[model samples]
Every structure is written in structure tokens, then in C-alpha cells.
Target chain A: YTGFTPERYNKIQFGMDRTLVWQLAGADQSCSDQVERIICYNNPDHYGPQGHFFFNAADKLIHKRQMELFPAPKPTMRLATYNKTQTGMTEAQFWAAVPSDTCSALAEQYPNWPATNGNLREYVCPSKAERFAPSAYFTFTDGKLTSRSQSQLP
Target chain B: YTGFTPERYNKIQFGMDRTLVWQLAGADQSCSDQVERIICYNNPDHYGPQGHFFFNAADKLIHKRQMELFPAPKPTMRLATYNKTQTGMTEAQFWAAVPSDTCSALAEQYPNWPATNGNLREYVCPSKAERFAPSAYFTFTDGKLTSRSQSQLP
Candidate 1:
């Protein structure tokens, strides 16, 4: 569908409808810090993107920014990717359809991508289980989708 | 109404049905810390109570708690009662029927009891129009409803 396609996620501009993308992804948790939007879910499983997600908010997303921890002797960056929705999909139908193949593609690109339940990743990366750890995040302005990225790698 | 009532609130045994009690009041916000329990909500108004609420979780709720807050503080120790609920009462319906009169009676028993909404003190003491200083609070353990109270005071 034209709503929000993972493949075409890059085209998503600021102030776009967040409902279609977020609701369809069935975000487990979300909070608005004003400058930046936050979305995340949990999954304490071992290896490859456990239950964690984070985002760095900014008044200006002039350039891609990775969310990193503050004031630390050894600051490890939280990292993850923006998994936008695929085309021709409705929120209801989105949950019904699974996309191992897409996650398969993800695996091809990143050796760290997980194997199970990757379909929903189109909208969220489900980063580290801990909020402080390196993870992925998305940006939103007034219920509108904006940007997504990982932490500045340590 | 065979659930939690002001008359039977003290009867609450921690680690029992706090979840249900918390759920019914729409607890605003709550978190667990083994022996301690914390709950808070914002009034978003001004005057009697500020625009925030806070609670410092303790095993035993010694007194009335406030649902209000200031520019800065540990949020003080505002607390009072806890009221459980029976079947058929959706969380939404329960909120709509805030027990302000009950809080008035609590006013007589406790010098710090909130005058806004204290009915069903055993279950909860709903209070305030907007957050600034005055607010309500409750105690719970493992999902069991325990005590309810309003803010500490001016």
C-alpha cells in the first residue's frame, strides 16, 4: 500500500501520518519526548536484536543521528534500523502476513539481524532489551512518522 | 460488587490482586519494586494541585498521599486509601464516578486527607482537576490493592 513501505521507508518525510505505520506495527511501547519520538518492544531472547529499541530526539534532524548514552567512562552506542512497512498491506492484514523472506533479506545485509518474526521489523527493529544499550529508534512529530536510525557506533 | 471496597480495603493482602485494583482505578501510572509499590498521575491543571503526581513506594502506606507536585521535590509522601471493584464496572466507568464525597469523610479521620475525591478510600481517593500540587495516591503489592491517599499537603 502507499501508506508506508519498508522498501520505500526512506521516502517517508517528517509530519507524515504515524497511525498507519505505527498501529500496523503494533508497537509494544511508545513515548514522546517532544524533540524526538520513541518506539520499542521487548523480547529477552538471546542473540541478534533482543527486546530493545531507542531513538535520539533533536530539534533538527539535519543529518542522521545515532542515539548514544550520556556521561560515561565507556559509552557504548545503542543501535538498530528503521523497518518501515511494505507496500500493498493494511494494518489488520499486516499482522496476519509474516515476512521471513524480508528478514532473510535483512540477514543478507546485516549478519546481526535475527531470524524469527521479521515481518513486523518492517516498522520496528526491536533493538536491545535494555534501554541503555545500543539500539534503533524512530522520529515522529505530532503523531507523524519522521526518521529512524541506530546509535553512533562505539 | 464482591471485589474491593473501602470497607474491605485494609483486608488487602499484598501479592494478591494489586493488578486488578491498579487496573480498575486506571492507576494513572504504577511500578513495582519487590516490597515497595509506586503510582502517580498528572492533573495538568493548576492551584490546589500542580500539574504532576508522585509516590515514594513503601511497604506500608503510613498516611495520606497527594496527587499534586511542585517545580521540584522527592515528591513528598502523599497517600491515603485503596478501593477495589466488582464485575461490570469497566475502568472507564469507575473513573467517571470519582468518589469525591468519600474523600470529604476521610478529611475528618485524617488531617491530611484530600477534600476533593476520597470516597472508596479503601480502593482509591480520586482527586484534583489539574495538576500543580494536590493529587491522590494508592498502595499495592504484586497486583493487590492495599491503601489509598492524597498528597502530603501545602
Candidate 2:
């Protein structure tokens, strides 16, 4: 019955050890045959969390993707919250307007990543249906809020 | 009164002269003041065609974008048509499944264009209520169909 949530998911950061992950989220329901290179948790319930964690040969988590379906009265960005967000706000100030519980983690970009030349991150609020959710997108450049816009689906 | 139509709009190709465009689609109803750099035709009716054509300094058409609201019995790519499209289809064979009248023109890419590394083009059949239309996207690489998928909104 255990499912993923944004709060606990944050603690499972990149490069954490596999044992630490098991301690935090419970033993993964699935694992790579014999090799145990990938661990996964899939909630059989309708509203539980599901995600996969990838580990390197050293058994250290390299990447992970965890997702959850919102319940009734789904969390989303409101007009009041939107008003509090503006371009040029510091990263900390922007997060105050959009809470992690209402949106997924932002995509982190590094300078070494040629596709995205500079420091950039994108945060978006999820809608009920997940697939059809109309959501707001906030972009940060160099730790300052650069733009806010609507994304139909992602 | 003359709204754009896919049949006639296709005739107005890139690099065509302004006078030729007027002759094909009719005299544009709107134009940039004095400069006449941009000419437009916006249908007063909900179901009519609307778009703009840009002319270079020499008064020759450089770029244009035309759109129309599909009428009742809207044009769309049916599931039956979807079955006919397959990977590795030649440029001509791919077009057989997707009629130009049913979708917008494929984005013509060139080797000189660094953004798109090779010859790549994308075609999509727009749905009614254009903005919210769920459409099918087909991509061609080097004159052969590489992939096809559904795009929620454009």
C-alpha cells in the first residue's frame, strides 16, 4: 500500500546508496534478475506512487523517476499563488509561491549539458488526469526566475 | 470574404512573388501601413481562413502562415488511415496515407540548418478547435518515414 510522495522522494537524492533508499522507501518490489542493477516499486492501488531507481555497478543510485496520481481535490497552482511569482525573483522566493507537493521536481540542467548551455530548471504543476492536466511552467536561469507560462501537457 | 483553404493555400509556396500570392488567394484585406511588408487576410466568419504573409524588402513573399477552422464533418486522420502509415515509407508513399488537405505542410529542413542535423520534416493533421486538437505527427528522415506518434496540442 506504500506509494511515492514528493516529501520522501526528495530525500532519495541522486547518488544515494541503494541500501539508504531501501531504508527510506522500503524494499523495492522489483529488481534486475540476479544483477540487482535496477530496483522498482509499483503500487497496485489506483492512487499509490510508482517509480524506478537505477543503480551503478557499485550499487549507488544514479537516476530515479518517481510519480504519483493525485487524489480528489488535487494539488495545483492557484491564481493567488501565480500572483506571488514574478520574473527576477530569487530561486528561494519563487519556491515560496509554488510548493513541491503541488508540482514535480524541476529538470536540472548543467553547463556541461550542451543542449541547455546555462544553468536552467523548469517547474510545473500537475493536473488531475496527469496526461491532460493543464499546468503552469516556471523557468529559472542562473538561480533567478526568468519566465512563467502555461504548458498544455507534458 | 475569401478565407484560406488548404487546397488553394498550398499553391502559395515559399519565395513566390506578392503579386502572384494576391492572384492565387485574392487581394489580402490587411497590410502594413505604408511599408506593406506584411499582408494578411483574416476571415470575419468563424469557419473562414486566416493567415499572414510576409514580404521581404524587395516585395517578394518570404514566409507565410495560413490557418482555417474546419467545418462540420471536420477533416482528420482516421484510425483507418493510421493503419496505412508505416515506418520506412518513402516520401511519396508516406504522403499517400496523409493528404496535404488533412494536415499542414512538413517542415522542410536542410543540411545547412544546424538545428536539425539532417533532412527531417514533420507533418500533423490538425483537429477542430485548432488549439486543443489532438493530432497525429509523422516524421520523415532522409525522405523516409522514421516515426509516427500522437501530439496532444501544437
Candidate 3:
């Protein structure tokens, strides 16, 4: 009783539409009147098996949960430094191929190659002996560039 | 050719305006169109120098550079911890304030403090000494919490 009247509750349908439109349009929607158009198209029963009110609540909860679980897919890139001890590839060859632009550029440079290919690019770092020699490493979303010192192997 | 014609653009504007009216009552008139309104208000001078674009290309470039130079603000918080070296406040005193939650909660529990007195109710971790102490640090922003480990003090 303290919350939404039938008329006021109907407005939520319009609000939902406006919110969806704004989100889809990259938060560019500027008009409030469009909410009326949204509410006009509203059919409470159209909420699938769940009632409209419960469905709306569930949708919001699910959206919130999903947002928590799967955040925005941020751009990520991998960096590999050459180590002569690990991979046969020399430092010069590794650095030469590694694209230094954004993460996407780096990914484009060293795409998923077949495992059978022997002549693959490698990162050589004496410090990390446990990791694969002349191998690849994944940088998580929003990871920054890291540097490691290494000498070129002939 | 890819963009909208002037007339079609105007219809987009009308549609946006109607949408705005339906969403929020007595919202500003500027909240009418999507592309036209936002671009005009945010970056009008794309057409010419006469229009007062709130943010020009140069501004955007500068902002991008600034963002790189000074990355987005990371959440930070202070914590109270036991320090055996410090005098006056003994290990017992520190441990008595144990679970540091009591001290931390004090900040939020007593919100109304005398403006004349400095914010003593809030705990301020000593910059240097606290670095080595076993402390709990956390930061909250945008309804999300981030925490740092005691060993990973910075």
C-alpha cells in the first residue's frame, strides 16, 4: 500500500522500456515521453509464465546477478619476452613480432596457431624457468604491460 | 550517406523528445533528441567554430592522454592494526581494540560529530608504520567492495 498504486505501477512498465532503450542506445535516450509508448505496448500477461510484477522483479535481480558474475568484457592483450634458455627463438625475433599497440593488436599479431607448428613465437625470461619456453601467457582483463629482463640467445 | 538526412534526423529528435516526456516529468527541454541533442550539447563545433561545443576533439584527446597518464582512481581504505614497536599504545591496547571492526565501525556508527573537532572518530592509518602491520584494508565504490591482503601492503 505504501509503494506503488495501479497507475503508478503501470508507469514502471514504461520506465522499464525507457531504461532498456537507453541502455541499448548506449545511454543516449533523452526523451521521457517515449515511456508512454512503451507502457502502451505493455501486456501484463506477456511476461511469460511469471506474473508481470514478479517477472519484472526477477528480471532485475537476474540482471544484477549476471552483471556481478560476468562483468563487461574488457580488452586484454598478452605480452611475451624472449628468453634464450627457454625457447630456441632469439630475443630480437620475439620483440620484432610482438605488436605494442593495444591488447587487441597484440592478439591479432599472435593468433591461435596449430599446435603442430614448430616455428611458433616464444617469450624467453630466465627468471621464470617453470613456465613454457618460447611459450604464450594470458593477461587477464585490464592487465597492464609488464617487463622482464632477458639476454638474446644465439 | 551512412548518417541520417536532416528530415530523418528531425524525426529522431521528435521521437527522443516524446520519449523523455514519458520518462521523467518536468525534465529539462534539452532532453529531447538523442544524437542531435547530445552531440550539439557535448560537441557542437564539429560543424564549425561558432557552435560552443562543451567538449571538442582537442578536449577529448587531452582527456584520453590524461587518462593514460593518471589511470582511473582505484578504491582505497585505511585500517587500524597492532604495532609492537609503537609506544604509549601498547600491544594489549592494540589487541584490546582487536577485531579492529569495533574501531572501524565507530566511523559509521557515530556519523554526527562536532564540526569544531577534527574527524577523530574516523581511524587514520599511519602512512609509514602501518605498511608493515597486519591490518585490514578495504574500499567501496559504486556499491561494490574491494579489499587488499595484509601482506600486500602498499
Candidate 4:
């Protein structure tokens, strides 16, 4: 019989899981003091440039507790590019097409971003434009884009 | 055919529901400390021995909140009667018959008084000897009984 082991158990699991415990403890202390804070993931840059970011069970638990205490903040959008000519679509586009009240609320939150009619042509991302492209889009109602990192893919 | 007289309407409908508004205003006043000094049912002696007590919805809500904040103190009990007589029954026997833990706890809290069959036989109320009957029909371990006014019957 060949000796085999699972890949997950073999390697060291570090990063978010360890960081989350401290983050949750801080949140507990802040809640006792009546101070609230919202923590969210950096979606487009989830793996950073190196592509080595991973969130484990502990991170999920901390995130769950945080959501229980405070309302969820706006979601971060991710844009992935396969080639140089065109900018890739985000998963948010699918959510926007559903036409539900929840989607409408999201639309209100991100004003400059177009929810319908496939208005990908209007989007202008002007910073990095080679392998992958990402930019913060706003809701159509208001011109406010909450993410500071959003830029034109050029 | 029933005779009916039609009356002309002069008042204009504003389309406003004032019931909720009025209730909210009252609640706001209560929260802001505009009204104070609430009398509760706990002070039964103040209302006299026999009288109907009234608790409005607001009063009930306040009582519930108070109970959530600070629970009432436990009641103290004194022994009344104890020990086996001609029947050869004991307090342990009575406790053994109780089906629930709550009843068992109640039995433990109440004290058994006048241990021994002879003391039970001689026990009687001086004021109303015909109405009062005593004598240990049963035996109890470390039993004692409190005043009749403080006794709770179920």
C-alpha cells in the first residue's frame, strides 16, 4: 500500500485564521465599550499580487460574529482579465440582473455602477491593464464609489 | 323596507393613522423620564389583604424588563411539622412522591416543624381548636414550618 496524506493537513495553515482570533477579541472589547466596526474582505485583491491569500474557518466565525453585531457593509467587486483587449465582467453583474429588492438596495449603495443593459463599455479602468484589471464601480443613482482603490484599467 | 335617512358628510379625511402616533408619543415620554413613580403589585400589603390588583400592558412590559434586569430574591421558609406518627410516613416519603425537580427544590426549601409522633398529636390551634388539626401523619428529616401567612399552597 502507498503512503498517502491529504494536502490540507500536510502544509501549514496560517494567516487569516490566527489573525481573526485577535480581531474578534478586539471587536468584543469594542462592543463592551459601545464602539462598532465593520470588517470586509478586499475582493479584487483577495490573493494580492502573489496569489497566496487564504481565509479559513476561524476567519469565517469572526466575520459571522461581526455581522451579528453590525449590518453588512458594501461588497467589494473583483475584475479578472484573460487577455489585453477587453476588461472582464464581475460576479456583481449577475446579481444586478436578478431584479430583486435586495439587488435594488445594492444598486442604491453603488450609484455610479450600471446594473442593467450590459454597460461594460462605459467602465474605464486606468491604472494596470495587462493580465488582470479591477476597478471600483458606483451605483447609478449617486456618483459615489466607496472603494478608494478603484481606478481605470489602462 | 327599513326607513333610512342619509346624512351629508362635512369632515375631510386626512389619511393619517393617529393611533400609532399617539402610542409612540407616550412611549417617548416614558423613555425621556417625563413620567415617574410607578406603583407595583409586589407591595400587596399596601393594597390591604383582599383586593383585586390591576396590571396594564405597559406595567406588565415594565415588570418584564425589570425581571430581565434584576430577578427577585429567593423566598425563605420555616418548618411547620415533621416526623412519623401512627401512619409511619416521613418527609422523605413525601419528597419521593414529587415528580418534578421544581417540586423537590420547593420541598427542600420548606422546613419541617415539631418532629416526633407525640408533638404532632398534641399540636392544635388555640383560637380555633375545631378547625385546626395537628399530629404528624408523616415523618420528615430536619423539618420546620413557617407562619400560615407566608405559606404557599399548591
TM-score of chain A of each: 0.21, 0.47, 0.14, 0.18
Candidate 1 lDDT tens digits, B1-154: 1121121121111121334334322233322223344332332222332111122232222222222221112223223222343334432233334332222212111111122122122232333333444655433321222444455433
Reference-based TM-score of each model: 0.18, 0.30, 0.14, 0.14
Per-residue C-alpha lDDT of model 1 across residues A9-81, encoded as one tens digit per residue: 2211122234322332233332222334432222222222211222223221121111111111122222211
All candidates: DockQ: 0.01, 0.01, 0.01, 0.01
Ranking by TM-score: 2, 1, 3, 4
Question: Using TM-score as the measure, which candidate wins?
Answer: 2
lDDT of 4 by residue, A26-142 (tens): 323211221132222212232221101223333321111111111112222333331212223222332233211111111111111111122111122222323334443322211
Q: Which stretches of candidate 4 lie over 4 Å from their true place?
A: A1-37, A40-133, A142-150, B1-154
Which ten residues in a row are the worst by lDDT in model 2 chain A? A108-117
Model 3 sits at a Cα RMSD from the real structure of 25.6
Ordered from best to worst lDDT, the candidate numbers read 2, 1, 3, 4
DockQ of 4: 0.01
Candidate number achieving the greatest DockQ relative to the actual structure: 1
| Candidate 3 local lDDT, A83-144, one digit each (tens) | 21133333223324442111111111111111111111111222222212222332211112
Q: Any idea what lDDT model 2 has? A: 0.51
Error of 2 at B134 (Å): 59
Q: What are the Cα lDDT values of the candidates?
A: 0.26, 0.51, 0.21, 0.20
